[PDB]
Amino acid sequence: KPKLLNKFDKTIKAELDAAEKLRKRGKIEEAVNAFKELVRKYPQSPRARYGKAQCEDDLAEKRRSNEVLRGAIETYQEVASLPDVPADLLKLSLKRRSDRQQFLGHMRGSLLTLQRLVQLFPNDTSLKNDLGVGYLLIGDNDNAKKVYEEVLSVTPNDGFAKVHYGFILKAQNKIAESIPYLKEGIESGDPGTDDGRFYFHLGDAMQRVGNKEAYKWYELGHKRGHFASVWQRSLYNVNGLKAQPWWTPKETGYTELVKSLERNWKLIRDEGLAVMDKAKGLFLPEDENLREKGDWSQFTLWQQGRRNENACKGAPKTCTLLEKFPETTGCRRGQIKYSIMHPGTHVWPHTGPTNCRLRMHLGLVIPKEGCKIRCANETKTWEEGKVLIFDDSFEHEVWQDASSFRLIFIVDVWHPELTPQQRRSLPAI
């Protein structure tokens, strides 16, 4: 069905088919030099140029080389600029370019290629759907939203556009509105709709509005492999890690860290309070849409295993203290931060992104009553100078119905069963 040869390339179909046969049979070195010869003999051949690119692409996979792949990405573009490029070949070449650009993390370059693709094929629905993803991958939910509105103005039942539109709506806190789009799109079954994100957010959406069928969808997500359990709904996981909502210090093995936190708790408190008191902008409001109501702000010392040097100027002894514990300072899937919460605050039930961390909470200023945290089926409270430990990949929920402010210190650690290699290699979150 693919029509990849223009009239010129048909005049040399035998040479092109010989080169491609070498590639399909795995003789990459041989194929590279065959298509190189063809590109040399026929500088204007689109098919010879595409074969060169596919061979560079294959050679990048064999060597696991980003640099080689960057070369393939440029050759795929050369294909699109040659004379009389068949439409099927033009689409294949630029689509692969954008896909490989995404693989490298060149999200801005992929977006440019995707904008050119949609401009070349205005009627290809799937290219617009992929353009929307391109916007989402750069954090441009406004342009992404327009793309999917366009799409389902033309094609109202495209399941892919439905779940992506509902995902965008929920991100904008259009909870009730996003439900039908997320719900219908999963039941569609279209390619790209069987994604844990959409199961995660549909259930959460339904939970926030009281729609008691949310857990029916979580169990479904569990059946599809997206959630380890109905309660533990993180999506960036290492399978087999001990899963329990509450931990003791002994169970984590990080007993010296827990001791250092509790023994030095007044020093940690006083530095955090001193930062509050200066009243600069260092405590930032929570900005993940997790609050039903109230006031919640956080002052972060470490994130993604990276020390915030300016923050540590405001809590210099606390930061010096923590350097002794790479299990937290090097936890590239966690943070170290102070968290202040004021009266009249309720945090929605929610889950963290990964099962590769545990969270330690050290009480610093805890009103005698009104402050609660539930994780899974158990509700606990903080105490000044004491550490609580839970797995925030389990659903958890917080209340602040006290008469004054509540301050804690949050120290993330690698899940103890993660190996040193896993701790060095896992992508940061």
Partner: peptide, 18 residues
């Protein structure tokens, strides 16, 4: 944007090829 306490971003990791 980053996924700190939740799963708000379309993707929570920044891939870098091989």
């Amino acid at each position: 944007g980053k996924c700190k306490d939740g799963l708000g971003e379309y993707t929570c990791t920044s891939l870098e090829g091989f």
